[PDB]
A and B are shown apart, each in its own frame.
Chain A
Amino acid sequence: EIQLEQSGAEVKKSGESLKISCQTSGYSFSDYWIGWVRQMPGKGLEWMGIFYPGDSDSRYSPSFEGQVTMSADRSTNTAHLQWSSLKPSDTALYYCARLGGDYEDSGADAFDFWGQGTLVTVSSASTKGPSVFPLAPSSKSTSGGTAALGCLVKDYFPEPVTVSWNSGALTSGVHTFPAVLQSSGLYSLSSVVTVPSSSLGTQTYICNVNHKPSNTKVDKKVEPKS
């Protein structure tokens, strides 16, 4: 049964070289084109090129020509994709696929069997702990019910960050949001709690941010704005 098996996830620094792999089984490796397809986070599938192991023929999509190299090791039935200088924008899931279908005695036309994909993350940032700022209660004595306050956890690398409130004693109405990745390569996220408006001048609200890569703990006091 035809299978393509791709190498594991890669976390690299920008400027570094990388070779990824796709090993095949179930058919004559030399005889079928192998294609590569890229998916950037939140984007669609994008064709990179096809490589023919039997004679080392290649076709690159115009955007990929000169930016990446396809090759193949016939001693090991392994197709490769490589970068000499990885850029942040190469952060993507990369698929390998066979061009086949076998709908006629000869030829190929559709990508039929697919590798499971290999994730590559490329960053130009280094370990940095966050700035934690308080997100103050939008007004105090509004007669509309509950209130929203939080912690902005700004400019850290890498993931993850841990957030708690009143050292985990406050969990009700807590929503900590997935990070945004900025063009700087640093992340920011926000954590917000829903509370009674009446107990602002009563119950203190501290958020507890923990960023273990940089070994940062920060406890910030979130109070009504002046």
Chain B
Amino acid sequence: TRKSIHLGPGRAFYAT
């Protein structure tokens, strides 16, 4: 991917 953004442990935006 590389589009998903990891904000923190166990959490992300733009995930699939």
**A interface residues with partner B (beta carbon < 8 Å):** 31-33, 52, 54, 57, 99-100, 103-104, 106-109
Which residue of A31, A54, A103, A109 is within 8 Å of B5 (Cβ)?
A: A109
Q: Which B residues, 1 to 16, have Cβ-Cβ distances below 8 Å to chain A?
A: 1-7, 12, 14-15
> A100: which B residues are within 8 A, CB to CB?
2
Contact of B5 with A33 in the complex, beta carbons under 8 Å? yes
Contact of B6 with A52 in the complex, beta carbons under 8 Å? no
Contact of B2 with A106 in the complex, beta carbons under 8 Å? yes
Shortest C-beta distance, B10 to chain A (Å), equals: 12
> A52: which B residues are within 8 A, CB to CB?
3
How many A-B pairs have beta carbons closer than 8 Å: the answer is 34
Shortest C-beta distance, B11 to chain A (Å), equals: 11
How far, in angstroms, from A108 to B7 measured CA to CA in the complex? 9
Contact of A31 with B2 in the complex, beta carbons under 8 Å? yes
> B4: which A residues are within 8 A, CB to CB?
106-108
For the complex, would chain B's binding face be called helix, strand, loop or mixed by DSSP majority?
loop
Q: What is the chain B residue whose CB lies nearest that of A107?
A: B4
Shortest C-beta distance, A34 to chain B (Å), equals: 11
- B2, B5, B12: most-surrounded residue (chain A CB, <10 A): B2
How far, in angstroms, from A197 to B2 measured CA to CA in the complex? 71
> B14: which A residues are within 8 A, CB to CB?
57
How far, in angstroms, from A107 to B4 measured CA to CA in the complex? 5
Which residue of A31, A54, A57, A107 is within 8 Å of B6 (Cβ)?
A: A107
13 other contacts beyond A103-B6, A107-B15, A108-B6, with CB at 8 A cut-off? Answer: A31-B2, A31-B3, A54-B3, A100-B2, A106-B1, A107-B2, A107-B4, A107-B6, A107-B12, A108-B2, A108-B4, A108-B5, A109-B6
How far, in angstroms, from A32 to B4 measured CA to CA in the complex? 9
How far, in angstroms, from A191 to B1 measured CA to CA in the complex? 59
How far, in angstroms, from A100 to B6 measured CA to CA in the complex? 10
Q: What is the chain A residue whose CB lies nearest that of B15?
A: A107
Contact of A33 with B6 in the complex, beta carbons under 8 Å? no
Can you identify 9 A-B contacts, CB atoms within 8 angstroms?
Answer: A31-B1, A31-B2, A32-B2, A33-B3, A52-B3, A103-B6, A104-B6, A107-B3, A107-B15
How far, in angstroms, from A32 to B5 measured CA to CA in the complex? 10
